[PDB]
Coordinates of C-alpha atoms in Angstrom, one line a residue:
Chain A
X1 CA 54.1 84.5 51.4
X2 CA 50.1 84.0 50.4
X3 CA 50.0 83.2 46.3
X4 CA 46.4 82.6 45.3
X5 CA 46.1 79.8 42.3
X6 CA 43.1 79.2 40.2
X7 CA 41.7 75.8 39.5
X8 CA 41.5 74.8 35.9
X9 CA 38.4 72.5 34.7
X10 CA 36.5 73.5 37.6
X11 CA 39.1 72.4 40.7
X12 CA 38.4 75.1 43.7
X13 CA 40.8 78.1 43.4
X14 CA 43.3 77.3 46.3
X15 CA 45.6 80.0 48.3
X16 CA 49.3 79.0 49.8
X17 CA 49.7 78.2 53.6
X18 CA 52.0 79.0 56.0
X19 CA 53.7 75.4 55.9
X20 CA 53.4 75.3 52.0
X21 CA 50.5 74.1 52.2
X22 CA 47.4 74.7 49.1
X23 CA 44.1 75.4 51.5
X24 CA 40.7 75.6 49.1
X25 CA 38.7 78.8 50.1
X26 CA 37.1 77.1 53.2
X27 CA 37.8 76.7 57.0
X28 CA 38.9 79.3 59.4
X29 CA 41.3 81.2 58.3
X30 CA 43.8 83.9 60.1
X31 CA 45.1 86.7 58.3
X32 CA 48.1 89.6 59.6
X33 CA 46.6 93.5 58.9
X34 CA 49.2 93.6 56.4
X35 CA 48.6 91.1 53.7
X36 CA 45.1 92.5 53.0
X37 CA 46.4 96.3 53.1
X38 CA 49.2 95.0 50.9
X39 CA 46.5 93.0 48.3
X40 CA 43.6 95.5 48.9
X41 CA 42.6 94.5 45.5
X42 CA 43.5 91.0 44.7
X43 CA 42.2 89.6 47.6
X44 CA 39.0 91.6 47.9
X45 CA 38.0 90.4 44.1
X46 CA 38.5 87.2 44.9
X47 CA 36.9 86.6 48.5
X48 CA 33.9 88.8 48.4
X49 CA 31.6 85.8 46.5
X50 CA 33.3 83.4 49.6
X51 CA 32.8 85.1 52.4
X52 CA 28.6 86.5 51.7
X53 CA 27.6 83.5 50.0
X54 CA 29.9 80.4 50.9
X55 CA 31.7 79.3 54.2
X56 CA 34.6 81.5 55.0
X57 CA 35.8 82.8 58.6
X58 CA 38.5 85.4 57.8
X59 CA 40.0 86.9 61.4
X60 CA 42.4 89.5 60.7
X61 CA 45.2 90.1 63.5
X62 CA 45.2 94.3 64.7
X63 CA 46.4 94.7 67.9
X64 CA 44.4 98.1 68.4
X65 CA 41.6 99.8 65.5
X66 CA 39.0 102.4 65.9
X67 CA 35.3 101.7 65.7
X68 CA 32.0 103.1 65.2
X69 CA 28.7 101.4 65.2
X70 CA 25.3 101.5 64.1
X71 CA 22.4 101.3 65.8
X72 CA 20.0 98.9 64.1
X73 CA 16.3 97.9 64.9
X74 CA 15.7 94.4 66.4
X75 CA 11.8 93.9 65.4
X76 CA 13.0 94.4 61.0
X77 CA 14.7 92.8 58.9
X78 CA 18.5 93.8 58.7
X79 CA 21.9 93.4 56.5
X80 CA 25.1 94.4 57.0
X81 CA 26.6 93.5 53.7
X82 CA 26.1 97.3 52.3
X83 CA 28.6 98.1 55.1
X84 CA 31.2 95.2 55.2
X85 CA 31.9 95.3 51.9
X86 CA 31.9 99.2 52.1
X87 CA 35.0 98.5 54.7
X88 CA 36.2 95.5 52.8
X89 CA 36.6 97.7 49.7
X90 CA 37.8 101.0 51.0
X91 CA 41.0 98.9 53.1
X92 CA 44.0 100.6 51.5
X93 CA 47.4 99.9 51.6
X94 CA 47.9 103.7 53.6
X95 CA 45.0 103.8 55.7
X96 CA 42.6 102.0 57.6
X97 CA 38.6 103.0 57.5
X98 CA 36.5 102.7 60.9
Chain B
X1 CA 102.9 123.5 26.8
X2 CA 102.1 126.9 28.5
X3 CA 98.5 125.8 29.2
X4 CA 97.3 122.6 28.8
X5 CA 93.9 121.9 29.1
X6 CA 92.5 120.5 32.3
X7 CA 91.0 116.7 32.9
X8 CA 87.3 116.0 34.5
X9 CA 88.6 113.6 36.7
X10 CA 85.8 113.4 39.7
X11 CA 82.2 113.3 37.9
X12 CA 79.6 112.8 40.2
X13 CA 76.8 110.0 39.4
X14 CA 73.1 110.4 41.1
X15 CA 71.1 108.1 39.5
X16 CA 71.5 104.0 40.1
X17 CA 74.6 102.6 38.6
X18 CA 74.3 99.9 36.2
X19 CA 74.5 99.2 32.1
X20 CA 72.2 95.9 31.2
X21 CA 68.5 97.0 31.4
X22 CA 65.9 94.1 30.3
X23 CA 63.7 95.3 27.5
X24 CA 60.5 93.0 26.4
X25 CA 60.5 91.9 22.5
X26 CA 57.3 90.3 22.2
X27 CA 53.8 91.6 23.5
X28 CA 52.4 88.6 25.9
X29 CA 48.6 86.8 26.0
X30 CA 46.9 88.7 28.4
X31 CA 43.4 88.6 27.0
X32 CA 43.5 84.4 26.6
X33 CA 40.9 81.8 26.5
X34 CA 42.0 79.8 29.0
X35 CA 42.7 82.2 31.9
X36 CA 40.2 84.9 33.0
X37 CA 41.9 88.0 33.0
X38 CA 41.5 88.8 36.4
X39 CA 44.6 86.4 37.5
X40 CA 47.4 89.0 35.5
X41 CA 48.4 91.8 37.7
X42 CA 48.9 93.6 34.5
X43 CA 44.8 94.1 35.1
X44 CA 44.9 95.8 38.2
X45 CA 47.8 97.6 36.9
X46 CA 50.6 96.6 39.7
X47 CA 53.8 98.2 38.6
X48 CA 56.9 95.2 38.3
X49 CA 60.3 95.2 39.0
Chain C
X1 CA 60.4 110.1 77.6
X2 CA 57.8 109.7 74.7
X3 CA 60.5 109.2 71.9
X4 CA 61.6 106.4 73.5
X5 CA 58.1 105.0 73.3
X6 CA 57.9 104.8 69.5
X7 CA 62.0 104.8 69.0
X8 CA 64.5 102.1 69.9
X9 CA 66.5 103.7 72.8
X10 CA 68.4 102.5 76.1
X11 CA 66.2 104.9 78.2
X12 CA 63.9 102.5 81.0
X13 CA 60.6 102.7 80.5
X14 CA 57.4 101.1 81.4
X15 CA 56.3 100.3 78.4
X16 CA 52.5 100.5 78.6
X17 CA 51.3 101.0 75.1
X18 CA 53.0 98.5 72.8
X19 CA 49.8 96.6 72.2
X20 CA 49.3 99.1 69.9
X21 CA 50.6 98.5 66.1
X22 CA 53.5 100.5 65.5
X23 CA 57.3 100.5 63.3
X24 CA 60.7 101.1 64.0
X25 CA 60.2 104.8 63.9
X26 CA 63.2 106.3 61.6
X27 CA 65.0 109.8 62.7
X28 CA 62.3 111.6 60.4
X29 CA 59.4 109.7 62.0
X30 CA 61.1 110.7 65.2
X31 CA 61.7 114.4 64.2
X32 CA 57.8 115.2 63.1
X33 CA 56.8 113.6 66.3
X34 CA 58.7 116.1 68.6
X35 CA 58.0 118.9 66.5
X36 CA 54.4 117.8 67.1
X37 CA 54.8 117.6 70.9
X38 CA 56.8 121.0 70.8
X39 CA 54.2 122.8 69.4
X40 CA 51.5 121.3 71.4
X41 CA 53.6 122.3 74.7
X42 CA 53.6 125.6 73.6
X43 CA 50.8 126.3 72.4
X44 CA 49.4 124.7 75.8
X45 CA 51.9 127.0 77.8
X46 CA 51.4 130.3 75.5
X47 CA 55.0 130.7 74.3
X48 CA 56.2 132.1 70.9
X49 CA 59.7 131.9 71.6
Chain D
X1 CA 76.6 97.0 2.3
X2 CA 75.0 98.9 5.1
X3 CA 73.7 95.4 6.6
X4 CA 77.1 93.7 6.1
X5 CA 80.4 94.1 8.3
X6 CA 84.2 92.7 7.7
X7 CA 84.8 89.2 9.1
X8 CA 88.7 90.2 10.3
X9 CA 88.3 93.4 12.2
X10 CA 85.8 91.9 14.9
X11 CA 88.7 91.5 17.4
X12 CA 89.6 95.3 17.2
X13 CA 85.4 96.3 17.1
X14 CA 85.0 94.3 20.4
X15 CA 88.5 96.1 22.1
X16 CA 87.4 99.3 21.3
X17 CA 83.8 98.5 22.4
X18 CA 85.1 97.4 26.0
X19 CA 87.4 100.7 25.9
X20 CA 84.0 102.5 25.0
X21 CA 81.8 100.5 28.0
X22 CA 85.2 101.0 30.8
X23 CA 86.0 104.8 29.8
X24 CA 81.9 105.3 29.9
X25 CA 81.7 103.6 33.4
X26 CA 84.0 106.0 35.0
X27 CA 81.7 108.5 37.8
X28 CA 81.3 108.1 41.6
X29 CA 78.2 107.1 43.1
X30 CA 76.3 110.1 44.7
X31 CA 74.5 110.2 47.9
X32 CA 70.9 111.4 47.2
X33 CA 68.3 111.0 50.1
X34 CA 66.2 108.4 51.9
X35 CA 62.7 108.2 53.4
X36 CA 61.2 105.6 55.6
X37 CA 59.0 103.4 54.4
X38 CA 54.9 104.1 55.8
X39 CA 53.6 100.6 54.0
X40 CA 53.3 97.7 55.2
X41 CA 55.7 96.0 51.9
X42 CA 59.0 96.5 53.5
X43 CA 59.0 96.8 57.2
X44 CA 60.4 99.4 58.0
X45 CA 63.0 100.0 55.1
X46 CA 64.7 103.9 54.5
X47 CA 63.8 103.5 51.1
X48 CA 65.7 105.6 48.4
X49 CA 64.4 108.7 46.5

């Protein structure tokens, strides 16, 4: 039971704890697999402008997930944004990308 | 009274069993001034019970 | 000895791989995962049969 | 009048509705199928087709 709420008049948009709780779209969070492959689409159009620009710590409880990584070049200039939100949009409710 | 005609008496139902359905009457305020559209599920299309 | 892995069974086991995410696998589930093993054993083994 | 009805006869109208809705409501419930759920909604629910 997560319910996201907007904030009218400018108030902070504010998502349901655990406890029953209204959290504002700071902290640490902790978040099961399953409520973002269930909300693939509400959540991700709501978080993505929190978690590149503002302070938000999401850690999402797996168990077990497959990886691959890139190899980037120390001495530039890098960004990983183009391929978190690649991730972050392609999360479906079936499947799970690398 | 040398042949009567036959009653259906066991008539097998396969869909889900039950007469009052709710039906909408008025169309609702999705596109309002006050909320931004993205807050209705009806926008992302989520199919409701 | 690896349907009672996944499945809910009396049969002692160790147990070694339930860090992994699973579900309550459902006599479907079940079913396509020993057809899967069966026809990996034989194709390993060369049978037709 | 088309749009009008008779005042005194709403007592039989409503018995022979309810004969209607009771002689309507008269099959047997048919087993169909199931399939376990693979989403994450329900955990792990046999879900019915």
């Amino acid at each position: 039971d997560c319910r996201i709420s907007f904030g009218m008049n400018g108030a902070a948009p504010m998502i349901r704890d655990e406890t029953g709780m209204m959290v504002p779209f700071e902290g640490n969070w902790i978040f099961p697999l399953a409520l973002w492959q269930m909300n693939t689409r509400y959540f991700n159009q709501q978080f993505d402008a929190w978690i590149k620009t503002g302070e938000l710590r999401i850690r999402i409880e797996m168990g077990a997930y497959p990886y691959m990584l890139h190899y980037y070049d120390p001495r530039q200039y890098a960004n990983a944004w183009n391929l978190t939100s690649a991730w972050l949009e392609e999360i479906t409710p079936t499947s799970i990308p690398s | 009274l040398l042949h009567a005609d036959t009653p259906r008496l066991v008539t097998w139902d396969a869909g889900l069993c039950t007469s009052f359905k709710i039906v909408p009457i008025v169309p609702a305020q999705v596109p309002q001034d006050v909320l931004a559209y993205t807050f209705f599920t009806s926008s992302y299309a989520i199919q409701s019970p | 000895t690896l349907v009672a892995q996944i499945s809910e069974t009396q049969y002692p086991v160790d147990r070694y791989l339930d860090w992994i995410p699973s579900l309550r696998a459902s006599a479907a589930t079940a079913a396509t995962f020993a057809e899967w093993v069966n026809t990996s054993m034989k194709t390993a083994f060369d049978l037709s049969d | 009048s088309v749009r009008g009805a008779n005042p005194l006869m709403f007592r039989a109208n409503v018995l022979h509705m309810l004969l209607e809705f009771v002689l309507d409501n008269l099959y047997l419930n048919r087993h169909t199928g199931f399939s376990q759920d693979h989403t994450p909604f329900t955990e792990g629910a046999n879900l019915r087709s």
